[PDB]
Amino acid sequence: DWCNVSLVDTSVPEPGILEHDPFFCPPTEATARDFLADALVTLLV
Amino acid sequence: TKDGLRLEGESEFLFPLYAKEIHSRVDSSLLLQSTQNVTVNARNSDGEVTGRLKVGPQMVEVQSQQFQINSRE
Numbered sequence: 001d002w003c004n005v006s007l008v009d010t011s012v013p014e015p016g017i018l019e020h021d022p023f024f025c026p027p028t029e030a031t032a033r034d035f036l037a038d039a040l041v042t043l044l045v
Numbered sequence: 046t047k048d049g050l051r052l053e054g055e056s057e058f059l060f061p062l063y064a065k066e067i068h069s070r071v072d073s074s075l076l077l078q079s080t081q082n083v084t085v086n087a088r089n090s091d092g093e094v095t096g097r098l099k100v101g102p103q104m105v106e107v108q109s110q111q112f113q114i115n116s117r118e
């Protein structure tokens with residue numbers, strides 16, 4: 001059938017990260033103190 | 046009290062909170078609600094939030110690299 005003869009040639013058909021930033025959540029930094037020496041002073045006076 | 050401190054009132058913290066273990070009472074069920082959404086967040090060592098369990102206004106979202114389900118074992 002010559003009517004459905006198809007010819008095709010070459011053509012030019014030419015058509016991940018994860019991150020979220022919150023603002024802050026710092027813990028108790030510099031965790032050290034004492035309430036004896038000052039108590040000793042104010043109970044030694 | 047001797048071993049703790051009991052509070053019966055609305056302790057509005059006008060600044061952030063910090064703790065290690067948040068419990069609920071034995072005889073009452075913890076509830077946590079809002080009007081827009083409630084967010085659980087977890088961060089990497091650089092502080093980058095990487096796993097979110099968000100309960101939005103309509104339907105829940107989970108955002109992560111993986112989503113397992115197991116049994117107790």
Ligand SMILES: *[C@@H]1O[C@H](CO)[C@@H](O)[C@H](O)[C@H]1NC(C)=O
Binds near residue numbers: 003004
């Ligand atoms: C190609 O074949 C189809 C199916 O038989 C037919 O409908 C169509 O008319 C044919 N095309 C031509 C140009 O004859």
